[PDB]
């Protein structure tokens, strides 16, 4: 039993809700919140900009030190950093950005990072400003993630379309 509330169950292990991931993180304080990161951990907009804003820029400060030490992530890769006031940990996961020309096949590799964590609160990878089809992202999530994932979808219209079209 966990504290996630109001989710629709899609499969044995995947759950979905129309919710602001920032507000959901602040309420649940999950062990792991997933950020829709880029390789530079520059949290300017989309989910990343919103999560970072909620940390009063502490996420960005921590991230800049991480990059200075380790260099950029790989597309499809991830790193674990602090969750600040939102979660115990933040799993920064880089899905391919279609608006940059990145291989959409890397979306499966990106979701594989979730399997290193038993339970996660997450957005749909590569959705939103990353330019991929969210219906496809949900399909890859369900077919790749085996751990327990709670998906927060900000847009109500998109949430309804994802549920109604789910196979
Ligand atoms: O401006 C703030 C703010 C943050 C901290 C403190 C005060 C104000 C803001 C802005 C946007 C959002 C929406 S989060 C989101 N965006 C995009 N895609 C998603 N998929 C799931 N969730 C999302 C929430 C808060």
UniProtKB/Swiss-Prot annotation:
Annotated organism of origin? Severe acute respiratory syndrome coronavirus 2
Q: Report the protein's function.
A: Responsible for the cleavages located at the N-terminus of the replicase polyprotein. Participates together with nsp4 in the assembly of virally-induced cytoplasmic double-membrane vesicles necessary for viral replication. Antagonizes innate immune induction of type I interferon by blocking the phosphorylation, dimerization and subsequent nuclear translocation of host IRF3. Also prevents host NF-kappa-B signaling. In addition, PL-PRO possesses a deubiquitinating/deISGylating activity and processes both 'Lys-48'- and 'Lys-63'-linked polyubiquitin chains from cellular substrates.
Determine the domain of life of the protein's source. Answer: Viruses
> What reaction does this catalyse?
Thiol-dependent hydrolysis of ester, thioester, amide, peptide and isopeptide bonds formed by the C-terminal Gly of ubiquitin (a 76-residue protein attached to proteins as an intracellular targeting signal)
**Stretch of the intact protein here:** 1025 to 1191 of 7096
The subcellular localization recorded is:
Host endoplasmic reticulum membrane
Q: How does it sit in the membrane?
A: Multi-pass membrane protein
The name on file for this protein is Papain-like protease nsp3
Assembly notes: May form homohexamers. Interacts with N protein.
Instruction: State how changing residue 164 to L affects the protein, per the record.
Output: In strain: Gamma/P.1
* Activity regulation, short description: Inhibited in vitro by GRL-0617.
Q: Which residues form the Macro domain?
A: 1-167
């Amino acid at each position: 039993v966990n504290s996630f509330s109001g989710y629709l169950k899609l499969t044995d292990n995947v759950y979905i809700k129309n919710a602001d991931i920032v507000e959901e993180a602040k309420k649940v304080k999950p062990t792991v919140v997933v950020n829709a990161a880029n390789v530079y951990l520059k949290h300017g907009g989309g989910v990343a900009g919103a999560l970072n804003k909620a940390t009063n820029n502490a996420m960005q400060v921590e991230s800049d030190d991480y990059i200075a030490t380790n260099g950029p992530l790989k597309v499809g890769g991830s790193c674990v950093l602090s969750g600040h006031n939102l979660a115990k940990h933040c799993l920064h996961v880089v899905g391919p950005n279609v608006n940059k020309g990145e291989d959409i096949q890397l979306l499966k590799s990106a979701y594989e990072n979730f399997n290193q964590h038993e339970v996660l609160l997450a957005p749909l990878l590569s959705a939103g400003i990353f330019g991929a089809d969210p219906i496809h992202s949900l399909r890859v999530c369900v077919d790749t993630v085996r751990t327990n994932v709670y998906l927060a979808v900000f847009d109500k219209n998109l949430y309804d379309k994802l549920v109604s079209s789910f196979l």
